[PDB]
Ligand binder design. Structure first.
Ligand code: NI
Length: 117
């Protein structure tokens, strides 16, 4: 999916920020989270997060659900390179496998699970 953040910040600047954050705070992972445009749910308040590497995907799901006022009963899916990661993965593992070359991890969220964004 295209991210508004990538459209509005040039690569070299994103990179410079990502590198710096990872050098300075090696136990944090910088993430950009955006809603798939057609998804008919709540938009996100904050798009940039610096999370603990040992935070789980399930925990981050709980945080984002709670920011957009969704309960366990509402569909919400995270997509990273079009893969929906397991709740047991840590954000640090996700970052290591799937960070972009600007040193940020990109998560797209939607209410549909089957199709790539
Ligand atoms: Ni609120």
């Amino acid at each position: 999916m295209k991210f508004v953040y990538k459209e509005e910040h040039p690569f070299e600047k994103r990179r410079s920020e990502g590198e710096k954050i990872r050098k300075k705070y090696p136990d944090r992972v910088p993430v950009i989270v955006e809603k798939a445009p057609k998804a008919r749910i709540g938009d996100l308040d904050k798009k940039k997060y610096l999370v603990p590497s040992d935070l789980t995907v399930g925990q981050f799901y709980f945080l984002i659900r709670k920011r957009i006022h969704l309960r366990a009963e509402d569909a919400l899916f995270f997509f990273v390179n079009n893969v929906i990661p397991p709740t047991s993965a840590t954000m640090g593992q996700l970052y290591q496998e799937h960070h972009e070359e600007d040193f940020f991890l990109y998560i797209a969220y939607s209410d549909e699970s089957v199709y790539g964004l």
